[PDB]
Amino acid sequence: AIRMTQSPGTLSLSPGERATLSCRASQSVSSSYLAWYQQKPGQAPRLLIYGASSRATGIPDRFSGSGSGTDFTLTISRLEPEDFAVYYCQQYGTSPSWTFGQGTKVEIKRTVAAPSVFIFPPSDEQLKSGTASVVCLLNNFYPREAKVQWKVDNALQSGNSQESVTEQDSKDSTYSLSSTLTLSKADYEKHKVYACEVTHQGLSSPVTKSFNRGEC
Amino acid sequence: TQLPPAYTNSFTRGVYYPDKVFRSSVLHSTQDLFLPFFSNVTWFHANPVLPFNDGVYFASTEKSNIIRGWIFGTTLDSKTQSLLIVNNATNVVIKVCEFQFCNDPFLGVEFRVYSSANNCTFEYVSFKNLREFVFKNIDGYFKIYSKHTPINLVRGLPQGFSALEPLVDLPIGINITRFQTLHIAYYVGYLQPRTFLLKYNENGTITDAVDCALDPLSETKCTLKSFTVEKGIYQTSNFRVQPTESIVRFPNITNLCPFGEVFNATRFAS
Amino acid sequence: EVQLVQSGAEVKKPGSSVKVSCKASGGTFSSSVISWVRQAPGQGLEWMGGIIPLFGSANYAQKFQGRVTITADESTSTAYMEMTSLRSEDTAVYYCAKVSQWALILFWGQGTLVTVSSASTKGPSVFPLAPSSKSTSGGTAALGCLVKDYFPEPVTVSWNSGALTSGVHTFPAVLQSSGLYSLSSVVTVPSSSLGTQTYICNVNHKPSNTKVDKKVEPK
Amino acid sequence: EVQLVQSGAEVKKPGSSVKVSCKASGGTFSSSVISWVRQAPGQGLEWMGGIIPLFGSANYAQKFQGRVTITADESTSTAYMEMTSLRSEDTAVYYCAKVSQWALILFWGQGTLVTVSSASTKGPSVFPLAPSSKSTSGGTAALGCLVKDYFPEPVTVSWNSGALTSGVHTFPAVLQSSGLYSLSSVVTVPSSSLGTQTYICNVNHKPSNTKVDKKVEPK
Amino acid sequence: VYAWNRKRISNCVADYSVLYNSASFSTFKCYGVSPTKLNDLCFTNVYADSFVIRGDEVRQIAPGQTGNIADYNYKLPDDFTGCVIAWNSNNLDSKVGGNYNYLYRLFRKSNLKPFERDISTEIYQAGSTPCNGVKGFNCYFPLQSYGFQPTYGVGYQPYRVVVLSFELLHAPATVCGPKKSTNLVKNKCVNFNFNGLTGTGVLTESNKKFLPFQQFGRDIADTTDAVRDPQTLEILDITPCSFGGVSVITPGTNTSNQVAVLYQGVNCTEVSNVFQTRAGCLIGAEHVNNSYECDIPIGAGICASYQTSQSIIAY
Ligand SMILES: *[C@@H]1O[C@H](CO)[C@@H](O[C@@H]2O[C@H](CO)[C@@H](O)[C@H](O)[C@H]2NC(C)=O)[C@H](O)[C@H]1NC(C)=O
Ligand SMILES: *[C@@H]1O[C@H](CO)[C@@H](O)[C@H](O)[C@H]1NC(C)=O
Ligand SMILES: *[C@@H]1O[C@H](CO)[C@@H](O)[C@H](O)[C@H]1NC(C)=O
Ligand SMILES: *[C@@H]1O[C@H](CO)[C@@H](O)[C@H](O)[C@H]1NC(C)=O
Ligand SMILES: *[C@@H]1O[C@H](CO)[C@@H](O)[C@H](O)[C@H]1NC(C)=O
Ligand SMILES: *[C@@H]1O[C@H](CO)[C@@H](O)[C@H](O)[C@H]1NC(C)=O
Ligand SMILES: *[C@@H]1O[C@H](CO)[C@@H](O)[C@H](O)[C@H]1NC(C)=O
Ligand SMILES: *[C@@H]1O[C@H](CO)[C@@H](O)[C@H](O)[C@H]1NC(C)=O
C-alpha cells in the first residue's frame, strides 16, 4: 500500500514566518486526491486543502498546497497564532484505499527556558489507601524535549512512571511535564530516598530533587 | 540513400469489416474508404515520407517482424503534434508528443527515433506472414484495422480474398498528411471513398466482395445487389458531363457603395 | 448539502463488539466512497477501511483486515462499521469520511468516541500535594492536587472557585493499567504566601456528579 | 484597428525617381480610396492622386497628371506612389490617407519625407556674429551664430552647453540656391555683460557627426 | 480554451443523478440524449473536455456554431452526442490584478475540425509579409489573454465548461449508469435491456459464431437480431414474442350470437374446443371428420359452419 510520510517531524517557527510541510508518497500518487488537514488538540480534523491545491470553505488564503508525483507541499505563507496545530496529508481516491501522514506539528519558536523542578512527597491519606504517588513537576520549560528519570536509593526505576505534558501555552510558550511514580504502600516504605533527575537543554547539568520518606 | 520504388497489382486485397455488427448470409452495401480492386500499389524494399491522403492500406510479407512502426503528422519537425506508433507483435508505444524527428530515423538491434518529446497529450501502451493494415484519421480519431495471414508467395500479392478486422481507435485529434515507416518488401496502397458489396456467409465471414466502381459489370452487380447477373440489359447508373471550369460575369461597375454615411453618420434619425 | 451524522459515543467493556453508524444526506451516497478513519488519543489519524455503497465490496487496511467489518445500506443511506473483540487499544474516535465521484472534496462526520473500559462510573480521589518549605525555586513554590481513580472523562479542576487562574497547569489525564484515569493539577505561587494565602482545588466530575473541594497546606 | 505604415525617408538626386509605399492592415484596403497627399515644407496639404485597389484606375490632380503614378496591390495590400524626374520643388512629406467605404473616418500614414537635392552630406560652417559696441538697444545687445553650408537637416544649436536658454531664438533653416541649408541662432543679453559673460554656441550635425563650439566676442 | 483538456472516462459506472440534480450549473444542454436517461444507458467511452471561456461565448459551445471560440479554439461536430455543462467561476478564475492564466486563440489560418486541438504559438501572418517569429505589422501573437477580473460584467466573467461526449460505438460498453442487472431469463417474452439497448421479445441461446469484436447483429430492417450478454459472454437470439390477427367466425347475429375465434398463424399454446389449423389456432369450433361444402372459409382447406344442440363446427 502507498505510504505517506511527512517532513519535518516537528516544525518550530515564529509568527509571521513561512511554514513548509512536505509529504512523500512511496508511489506515484495522483495530485487530484491529496488532502491537507489541520487538527488542533481536542478537535476533529479540519480539512484545509483538497485536490492538493484547492482551499476548502473559509480557509485563509495564506494556506496553499502544491506538488505532484511523490512530493506534495503545504505552504503557510504567514504563520499566525491560529496556524499552530498538527497537519496531516491524506492520499485518497475514488477507490476504498486511503492513507494518512504521521502528522507534523507546528509550534512557537521561543528562547530556551530553564525548567523549574519540584518534588512532592505522597500524602498520608493517600498512603492509607495502600498506594503512594510521587509527583515530579517540570514547570515552564522549553523546548518540550526533556528526559526525566526516577532514582530510588540511587536505583533507576522503569515501568512504574507515567508522564503528562500540557500544550504549548499561548502566553509564555513554555511546556510543562508532570511525572508520577506510583507504587504500593509496602514497597514505598522499603526505601528512604526518592529523587527525580531532569535533563534538559536549558540546564547546563542535570537537576535532581529528592526527599526522604517520613521527613517533614 | 533510398532504393527506387516499384508497382504491383493489388488484385482483390485490402477489404476490411466496415463495422462490428454481426451479419450472416447477406449481401451488404457499404460506402467507405477502401482499396480499389486491381489497384496499383507501390512496392518498396527495406522508407521515404509517403503522404497519407484519405487513408493508407499497408502490407508487409515478413518472417522476423522487421517493420515495427510508423510516424504521422504534417511537418514532423516538433512544430506540431505527431503520432508515433511502434506497434510490433503485441507491444505498442503510441505517443502524440511534439517529436523532433531525425533526418534518417532507424531502430537498432537500441531506440533512436526522435531527438525531443514534449507535451505528450496522449500515450497508449499494450511460408511467410503477410500483415495487412488499414489506417485512417476521421473526426480527430485514428482508426487501425489489421489482418495477419500465412501465405506462400514472394513474387506478388496472392490472388484471393481475405478480410481485415478492426483493432485500434486512438483519440489523437491530430492533422495527418504525411507518414513514414520504421524498421529495425512492403506495399503502400491508398484508400478512396468507394462503395463495396460484401458477402457475409452463414458464419458471418466476408468471403467475397464487389467493387461497385471497378467496371460496368461490377456496377451491374451492385445495382442488382447480387453476384450473379443474368443475360439482359440493366440500367446501372447515369452519365453526366462534369463542368470544366467556372465562369463569373458581373456588371462593369466602378463605384464604391457609400455605406460610410449610413453606418458612420454623426446622428441617426428618429 | 451533504452532511454525515454518526451514532452517539459508546462505552463498551473489553471483549464486546460495537457497530458505529454514519447517516449521510444530500443524495450522493450510492456513488460515493465512504471510509472509516480511527484516531487513538494522542496519535495521528488512521484509515481502517472503506466501501462503495453501489458495489458493496468493502476494503480494509491490513491492520484492521480481520477485526473490522464495514457495510453500506443504500435504501437508508447509512454506513456501518462493526468492530468485534474490542481491546484496550481500540479506545478511539471513529470518523466516517465521504468522497463523491463528482467532487474532489471530502465530507466528514462529527466523530464517534468509543471507550473500551472494563470499569464503571467512579468518583475522583483528590490528594493535595503539600509544598516543601525547603525546595523553593528562587522564592516561588508550586502546589497542586492529584486527582486519581476516576471514570469516565472529563473532570474540571479550578482553584478557589476560579479566583486563581494564573500559573495553573492542569496536566492531561492518563489511562492507568487499572482502567481509571488520573491527572495532576498544579499552580505556581510565591513562597512568601504559603502561610498567607489559602488555596483550595475544586474538582467536578459530572458523570459521577461528584464535587470535591480540598485545601492545600504546607507540610 | 486599421493602420497605415509607409516606407522610410528617401534622398534622391534631381532627375531620378522615387517610389513611396504604404502598407495597410485591417482588411479594408481593397474597398477603400487610398490617396497621396504632399506637403512641401511650409506649404499646405496637397492632394496628389488617389486609387481604389478593387478597380485599379488611379486619378491624379491636374498638377500631378504626368509626373506621378499611383498603383495599388491587393495581394500585398500596398499602395505605391512613383514620382519620376524629381525636381527641387518635389522635396516634401508624402502621406497616404485612406477612406473605407464603410466609414467616414480617414486613416493617415506617418508621412515619408522625400528630399530632392544635389549636394551630399556636408559639415556645418559656424561664423559668430560680433555684437556691435555702439548699436546697443537700450542697454541690450544681441549676439548669435550663423550656421551655413550644411546638409542634410537637422542641426542643433545650444548656448554654453544649454546653460543659456532665456532669450534664445533658433531661427528655422532655409534652403539656399546651392542646395545647402543655413540658419542663424541669436540671443539678447544686457550690454553690460558683453565684457563679463562668455557665450559659446555649440552646433551639432549628426549625419556628418560634426560638433563645433565657437565663442562669440564683441568686435 | 485553445488548449482544452480532454480526459478519457472508461471502464466505470457513473450516477448522473448527482449531475443533473446539481444547482451549481448555469448551462446544462444535452444533444442526442436526455440528462435523465443517462442512468439507463451504457457507453463505450466518455470524453470529458474541460476548459474556461467567458459567458458571452458559452453559446458557441454547441453543435453548429461559429465564432472565435468555435472556429479557432473548440469545435463540436454536427452529429455530436453528449452534454455541455457550463458554470460561472468568477470566485475561482478572477483576480484583482487580472487573471492572465487563461488564453484563447484570436487568429487562426483556418477553422478547426471537430474535436481538434491547436497548441501552436507560431506568429500569425495576417498578410503577405512573413513574420519569421517576430511581431510587428501584419503579424500578431495568435493567443489573446482573457484577463478576467472580479469587476467584469456577467458576459465577461469566467465560465468553466465541461463537454461530455458519449461514444456509442459497436465495441463493448465500458461506461454505464448505476443500474443493477437482473438475471437472464430465456424462452419467455420479456422486456430486455442490454447495455442500454432496450427491447421486447424472447431471448434464446444461439449458435451464431460472433467474432470477439462483435457485440450484436442486425437484421435487414436494422433491428438487433442477436446480442452478446455483457456478463456471461454468450450470444442470444432475439425474436418477436408472438403476434397475429384475430378473426371472429360467426353465423349471422340473426342466427346466433355464438362465435369461434381464429388466432392467425399462432400455435395453440401461446393463447373448450381448441383445434390447430394451418391458418392458426381455432377456438370455439368443433372439428368434425365429415366434409361439407365450404360455408365460412378458414384456410388450408378448413371451413367453418353452424350446424347441429347447435354449435359451430370446423371441417
Ligand atoms: C493539415 O496540414 C496540411 C499541411 O500543413 C494543411 O494543408 C495546407 O493548407 C494550407 C492552407 O490551408 C496550404 O497553403 C498548404 O499548401 C497546404 N499544404 C499542403 C502540403 O497541402 C491542411 O490545411 C491542414 N488541415 C487542417 C484542417 O488544418
Ligand atoms: C502503376 O503506375 C506506374 C506509373 O505511375 C505504371 O508504370 C505501372 O504500369 C502501373 N502499374 C499497373 C499495374 O498498372
Ligand atoms: C507545451 O504547451 C504549453 C502550453 O500548452 C507551452 O507553453 C509549452 O511551450 C509547450 N511545450 C514546449 C516544449 O514548447
Ligand atoms: C462455419 O463453421 C463450420 C464449423 O465446422 C463449418 O463446418 C462451416 O463450413 C462454416 N461455414 C462455411 C460457410 O464455411
Ligand atoms: C469597364 O469600364 C471601363 C471604364 O470604366 C473600361 O475601361 C473597361 O474596358 C470596361 N470593361 C468591360 C469588360 O466592358
Ligand atoms: C333471420 O333469417 C331468416 C332466414 O335466414 C329469416 O326468415 C328471418 O326473418 C331473419 N330474421 C330477421 C330478424 O330478419
Ligand atoms: C406447436 O408447438 C408444439 C410444441 O411446442 C409442436 O409440437 C407443434 O408442431 C406446434 N404446432 C404446429 C402446427 O407445428
Ligand atoms: C376422426 O377419426 C379418427 C379415427 O381415424 C379419430 O382418431 C379422430 O378423433 C376423429 N376426429 C374427431 C374430431 O372425433
Residue numbers in the entry:
A (entry chain K): 1 to 216
B (entry chain A): 22 to 67, 81 to 143, 156 to 172, 186 to 243, 261 to 346
C (entry chain J), D (entry chain H): 1 to 219
E (entry chain C): 347 to 617, 637 to 673, 686 to 692
Article sentences:
A detailed structure-function analysis comprising 22 X-ray and cryo-EM structures is presented for 16 Fabs most in complexes with RBD or S, which allows an understanding of the changes in antigenicity of the Beta S protein.
The relatively high resolution (2.8 Å) of the Beta-49 Fab/S structure suggested that the complex is rather rigid. This “down and out” orientation has not, to the best of our knowledge, been seen before. The tight packing against the second RBD forms a secondary or quaternary epitope of some 210 Å2.
